[PDB]
Ligand binder design. Structure first.
Ligand SMILES: CCC1=C(C)/C(=C/C2=NC(=C\c3[nH]c(/C=C4\NC(=O)[C@H](C)[C@H]4CC)c(C)c3CCC(=O)O)/C(CCC(=O)O)=C2C)NC1=O
Lengths: 172, 162, 162, 172, 162, 172, 172, 162, 162, 172, 162, 172
């Protein structure tokens, strides 16, 4: 796994180079914006159970075929697996936010996931919907202006959305 | 690669757990220490050539035989001198990468793993490298917490060679 | 018990390694966050009785049946009322212990481990406890980083019950 | 394992009690002196290879019987084991310093050590000597007044010495 | 799926053995008990609607709050009422499948596995379901060994929820 | 493990003997009373969750020291373990009833249990109380004259009580 | 694994349905014919060693190439493997007869067998011959009218033959 | 020892489960089959001497060399004759124990385990024993289900020797 | 296949080691013993037919029933006689292969593995084969170390059948 | 694994044949030349560290791209792996020389090696160069006429070269 | 301890097998090679002092700095000179023990295991020892197979240091 | 494990000594008598099945209590174990003969054997009898003057007897 700092190091090591002033400046800037990133992770994590439950409930309201007898999330074992997978994907998205790099999400979660769902007969497009609904809820919570020192977390929200989209694209 | 952030993640992941406040405190500690670490990194980088060139001379002064003895593992030809200066520059570059990452991961991965095997196989003495590192430590020009950061990674390398 | 210090040690130990700078940064992060954590701990402790008594009423107001329904698992006798107030006080005491330790270890060890089994076996509803925790969160009277610390451990408990 | 904070919590939990104002104050005081504790761990660790090597060399100079043919540290396998044990004991002493509590040292290192050395025929009194020499070197390095903001680290040095003594007493 | 026949086979298979008389006796026991089990299955099936509708009312009578309290996990809207009747019908259908199979396999596979997770995640109380099962047990109209068979599988479900 | 039939065989095998007419008659009699034994196992098992829960609740009402902070069944982990042990002991008592022999209970459950509780600091006398309360509830349920063909199950009840007593004696 | 009863349940569960009267009647009929099925399994199993040995001896008489030096059943290791495979296939055919369903035979024995024999260089057509000879012997023994209450076991014999044919088709 | 009852228990135990109806059906099957099994046991026992004495002669008639050939593994001395009659009586006693237990456990434990090793080491031919068992099967005098029970255990032994 | 050379290699390989002098001594021992082993191999080969034909008669003389008794496992038909002579020739050929390889590997792989299973399944008596091997040992015509080599592999086979 | 003797046996066993006089004579001849083969293995092995080190140093002098930052043998972990692989290949070549057969080299070393290097991004053509340089050094040392009883080891040297070539061909 | 005899035993033991001819050939190879090995052992022993004293000088001549440089790891004091001569004598004694045992076991157990750790920790250069071993090899005075034996164990040590 | 040569080395290593001329001479003498030792191992091993079988048969003739129903070697499992133990003890005695040292026999076979037999209820005095009978048969076979170059193997026979006695003493 890499974090944002490790990734810049790795790139410099393969060139045999010390960091440039621009590179140093870019890492410094990440550090200076780090309280925003810690708030986003704390807020999402703190609301994880409702983000998952609410998105699940909505999915199944929109896609009743998934819970009808014979559907992929019918039976309590299948439902529990489906709920697990939502919490897993959200867990690895939040690791990516803390690290500022998608490598942990790509390597430990998304790699081979498409093929796993194909072999099972799980509908990846429906997984993607679930993801998208968690993304929307997560960003809303992360970027709530109440109860926090005011400031602009827009770049960070774009970065968070990109991780969720990356996940949704990898399963559909 | 071992950094305070990838350690925090790996810990939560091994237990199948979301990040908790224990882990986010560790990252905050890393973000606040980065001020000193980045001072040290930039200084070492800016003064790299002079540190490297000085350190190689310190080696040769401590161990004069390395400038005279016949054999490709010594610095008695132009090619050997260049290999030695190259190596010392690797060690300093790895110190700068540790300070940038906030941990030992870059030095562990790119230099320490295999180090004993390399030195034995090519007949490179660990003490040559320790001498170069001691020179860098004495002459980097840092003070305060920037000096504590640089010295922690220099001394890590020394311990790895001992 | 999981604290940022015992995590740092355990990590170094699993790899058979001395502590490095990666670990000492994590501890510094813990020592600096302790200012907010200890503010929160002391406040919650000082106002424990009123928080506990208020939280129990909030439960009873959300779930009135718990004050009337016959059965030892409900709060319809003096003995049940006392069990319920006792439990709510356990949850708050565990929050204070997390803030003191700097992590979830005390709540994990003394309350979460076995929690699902206990609630099922004695027919205690998780949602009763979630309601009490939501009351504590709304009414603790903290702001700034002290509030962020208290809420992180309250919300951890809520997630454990969900 | 416990740290200093965990130990106070554990004691309060077995009584069913919230912390007292005195207890809170005592933990606060540890936090306020924490930079000293981080310096001590960084300094000892940073010098670990020489602390071990120097104490070993002195031991064997004073106790030549240990390295003569037939002695417990004769043969490179036995010498390497003896050197390993010095580095292990020093490693677990430094964990105890970071934690402010001996539990990790007691539970993971010292428990059963006396009996291990008896079964091997390793002389525990000589192990104790090795320890004592590392303690002296460690404290000297930790408490060096050069190159550090001036202040009084005497209580901390007494605490460090006590961990080393605890180790030396457990093996002899 | 756990039935007396697949248990007998699995046992012989784990030991790499042909079926022996020990196993064929177990199957004969299953074939003779099937007379009572199939009586019970057919009765429960024939009277399913009335049992389901009665059982849901029993729940609502024991726990009136479930018909009034706001929230999607309760039976205070038409959609909730339908979810609840649907669930009770699942439980009864699983009882009929156990009686048909001669064991707990169908209930174990389709309902019990994951049951604790489901109830916690969607805030469904186990005691709601226990009440419905107690109603079915009191009101199925069976006697003799057919009643012993039905009750064994109903009580299995109750224990799984306790 | 032995059942009642296996035990008679084992005894005859060590003497090198075919069964006697008295031995055959005694096994036949067990078979003829087997419906009673199947009813007893079905009834106890069917009520296992309440037998455990009710006895636990009574124990802790009579022995509040066990649940007070510092007590052996304080904390949810310890309470869950205590409840587990009640269900385990009841489970192995019911195996003994089906087999008509205590060997499974002795070998898989009771052997070494006394020593386990001593090492933990668990009060075996309190475990015994729990057992006794389960025995009383189990026998009452097993021997309920409602809803069953009438007959005399008194010998069987004495046999069941003896297994529970055997368990209670092994832990105190 | 499924038995005949489990398979009907599984089919009803995926439709979300209680059983129909026709379904119930079909399972009842299986139960009523169960003594025939137990006789067939007991008779085949009781003669397993000769069914295997006799078919093997015939195979090798008809196909001497298999035992000549260089042949797939030359050497005692290869012969023992070949004999093992005959007993395995017969074992899983008899499980299928007891269950009234091929799933155990398909899942635990036949799946991947064709590919295993291809990789080895074992002749599947010759395995099929072996199977066919065991089928013929098994049915003859199962359906012997001596020493049994008279009745018509013709449907059952057709079912047994189908399992053997299914096996023979899967390996060639 | 493998009996239908200890199999049922062992199965529940491996899964950490109380006994269920699947297991109690298997025991009932055993209790009902015991009527035939015990008929067979008592008959074989009552007629043991004549069966044993007849079976040994059948061996000697099929394999006449065993009565003449020199060597302690043969029945050409009084001591050998006695060993052979003793062995045949062991086999019949083990058949009676299987019928009493309701399974193969007694024969598996006391005779089959080690059987190949014993026969090879002492140069005892399996076919001698198969011949004795075939005689017992032809001459026990049972019919109906008692005969099916006796023959199942006799044929089990034959298969174990083949 | 087990030979002194493949044993030496396998040993070094299991330890991830180059060959050392310990292993090269073992091979030299094999190369010097090959003089006797190859004498024995060539003799046995040259006289194979007569040894095989003599050995089969010795079997029939020790065990006359094998020439008369009805059944395909006996040598009472032309086909059985041919199977028996074929088998005896396999055993002798395997002895010659051991002497050529310098170890038991060929006999272990091509004949011993599965031997107990084969003899039991086809009702072949081990003692028939032991008798043939004893004849070969008595009649091979070798002396000195060639005889020690042949007898070591013949007696190995005898032990494998005992 | 096979040695030269085992291979002749295996071939005869698949034909069902005793050895011929020509076959016997060919094995005898190998034995008679065995001191040469033991000298070759002893000499190569005795010089293994320099054969590897010298070939490595030459490789990297001719192919500096391999050690530059980003190259496959840059970093001490990659260099140590590259050196390991040279010693492995030389180790299995010397086993083949002792055995007089390539089977151990083919089965335990070369099988799948090409594919391993492709997946890694290791340049097999450069591995081949390394091999060739070890072959040249090994043969020179093996066939040094100083310090040994004089004789002609030319056939043996051709056999040794063929094993090295076989290795070099399998990786490129 | 690894010798050709304990290797042969260990091999048979790992397979649960009696010794076979494969193993007894390996021991014979050892017994015949012992003639050369014991010649070498006795010679080295008889001339040990002169070899040790010569070898130490060769080190000092190749690496003159070792006689001047300040530090306890060098031979610039009487104590260092004595440590160095002691070490060289250990290496030669271990060579003699290998020749006596017929394998590398004594050197493996008493000197190689831990060797890398020792040299690194005490800052002893492997090349010092290689130089001493090269001197012994050039100057032992042996020829023929005795020389091949001595050199095999000397070169083993050299490889272990490389 | 040690052989005779290793044991002399070990003793010299603990004194820090090169071998003496007497020590060298003693090892040389072992080598010179080695053909006798190889004959003894080959002869015993070659007759292992009869040495075991004959001693077993005699034991049970003299001690019929061991095979009567209830006796320790009654049942085929117990008999097979008893026969196994005889072959094990003989196997490790022959390793000791090849090595010229008892260490392999002591360490891998005899250590803890007495205690194993006590816990089982196996009669060690009867095991000792079995051993003694194998010793007598083994020595007779080893020292048979027919079919071998004549010479005096008396010292070797005394050494072999001592290993068997050592075994017999360790179990009784
Ligand atoms: C411990 C392992 C062990 C080894 C290593 C050993 C080697 C060994 N090499 C030998 C001979 C020899 N070795 C060679 C080899 C060569 N001659 C050439 O000039 C070449 C360049 C070279 C090529 C490989 C020669 C020529 C002989 C004499 C002929 C023979 O015995 O085959 C001899 C016979 C005695 C002698 O002449 O010194 C032995 C025993 N034996 C051992 O037991």
């Amino acid at each position: 796994m890499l974090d944002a700092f490790a990734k810049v190091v790795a790139q410099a090591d393969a060139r045999g180079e010390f960091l440039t002033n621009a590179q140093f400046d870019a890492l410094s800037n990440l550090v200076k914006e780090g309280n925003k990133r810690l708030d986003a992770v704390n807020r999402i994590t703190s609301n994880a159970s409702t983000i998952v439950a609410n998105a699940a409930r909505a999915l199944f309201a929109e896609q009743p075929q998934l819970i009808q007898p014979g559907g992929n999330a019918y039976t309590n074992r299948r439902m529990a697996a489906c709920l697990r997978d939502m919490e897993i994907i959200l867990r690895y998205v939040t690791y990516a936010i803390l690290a500022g790099d998608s490598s942990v999400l790509d390597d430990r979660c998304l790699n081979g996931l498409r093929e796993t769902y194909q072999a099972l007969g799980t509908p990846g497009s429906s997984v993607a919907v679930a993801i998208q609904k968690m993304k929307d809820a997560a960003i809303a919570i992360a970027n709530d202006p109440n109860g926090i020192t005011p400031g602009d977390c827009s770049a960070l929200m774009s970065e968070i959305a990109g991780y969720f989209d990356r996940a949704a694209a990898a399963v559909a | 690669m071992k950094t305070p952030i990838t350690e925090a993640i790996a810990a939560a992941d091994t237990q199948g757990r979301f990040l908790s406040n224990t882990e986010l405190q560790a990252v905050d500690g890393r973000f606040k220490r980065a001020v000193a670490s980045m001072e040290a990194a930039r200084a070492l980088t800016n003064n790299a050539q002079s540190l490297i060139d000085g350190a190689a001379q310190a080696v040769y002064q401590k161990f004069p035989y390395t400038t005279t003895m016949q054999g490709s593992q010594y610095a008695s030809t132009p090619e050997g001198k260049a290999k030695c200066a190259r190596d010392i520059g690797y060690y300093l570059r790895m110190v700068t990468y540790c300070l940038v990452a906030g941990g030992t991961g870059p030095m562990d991965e790119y230099l320490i793993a295999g180090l004993s095997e390399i030195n034995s196989t090519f007949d490179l003495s660990p003490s040559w490298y320790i001498e170069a590192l001691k020179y860098i430590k004495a002459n980097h020009g840092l003070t305060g917490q920037a000096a504590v950061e640089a010295n922690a990674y220099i001394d890590y390398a020394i311990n790895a060679l001992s």
